[PDB]
Amino acid sequence: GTHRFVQKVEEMVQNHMTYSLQDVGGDANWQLVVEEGEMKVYRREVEENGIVLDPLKATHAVKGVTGHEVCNYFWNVDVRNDWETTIENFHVVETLADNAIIIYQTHKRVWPASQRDVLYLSVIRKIPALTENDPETWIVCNFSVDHDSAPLNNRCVRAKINVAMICQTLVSPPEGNQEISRDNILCKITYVANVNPGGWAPASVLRAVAKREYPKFLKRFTSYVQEKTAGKPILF
Template identity: 40%
Template sequence: MFQTIDKLAVEQLKYALAGVEDNVWSLFAEDGPMRMYTRQIEDEGGLPVDPLKATHSVEGVTALEFMHYFYDARYKMLWDHTLEAMSVVEHISPDSVVLHQKHKTVWPAAPRESLFVSHIRRVDEHKRDGAHDLYIVCNRDVQRADVPLGSSSSVRVGLTVSMICETIVKDPHLHRKLTRDDVKCNIIYVSQVHPGGWVPTAALRHVYKKEYPKFLRTFTEFVKKNVKEKPVSI
């Protein structure tokens, strides 16, 4: 399992840090510093599996803090409003876990579940000039015989999702304790989801173009609210 996770982290880091070419990616959402891009791709059966890429910048938060709330399963039900239920299947190691999620059903689609491994690591060897650090969280679907579908009508979603985050310390020569005003984090989020069973293509694309920006805004506000009164963790 370690080799699989390690390969996933390396692949996703390279993919996330690659540029957004104008002729390949199209911008579909813009809100302050947040930009969201997509490409229209369908699988062999005609199901939409559009990859998504988002860039964002958040003042007053470090990469470690942002990633802590994204990775830690204890918080998922508090910020991910698409979830009906979530459970930890296995703690593989301090930086890797297998999660099982049941998603709220959106008519007329079948109930959907996701089963995936989630991994977090610090990857400073890939950080850009001027960045204090660089972290990645990557998630990919897995199959396990000990986690059956919740019902005969349920569908298991395929997914590859990664979030990459760097901290910028605005004045790296400060010789005092950092405050929220001294830091910001830059975020790259990449996602490709296979819906599993049938879904109406146009409706799915309409939903994700509305829901992805909503997710990133909601999660950002959740993190900012939770770190506001706490000392900077870096």
């Protein structure tokens, strides 16, 4: 890349690829808090200074869409308001490359506390597969950065995030005279979110909100990708 965040991007993508994909099923520091269909949501309970930082990991498997498609929809700001429900306002502060932008946004008061905002680089990348036996990996990383055109606000508490949507497409081609269809593909999703609320809120409540809001998002977002791609040629 050309832009000034290229090194930080790679580090984030590499850290997600080595640590965020790690298996969490039989990890005793992780608790399965939500299950529904192919969807599972785990959390690790962590606090620093009485502030709840609980890392969150969700895994999902969505029939009929590719990882490329799910990442595309996740990243594309032009469709954000079609699925995202926790945001008051947002805008793009800077475009760094074709695949990388910085975004400022304010969240609805889902917490018993002052309104939060967040300012983050949002980048979409493909990680090539080592062999053709393996899926390519598409990832969108959303992580907090600073920018001059969005200094600390005086009304909102500035949250800090490290988030990734990581997707791999499994294909199961049919045996006969038929071409691959969407009935023959399945997107495996790992979604990780590490959010620093930027100040105190009662923990019991933050965990309630996380338990409620992440699975809601993943269902509506994934369903929306299924809707928008249905009947359309497959983008691997």
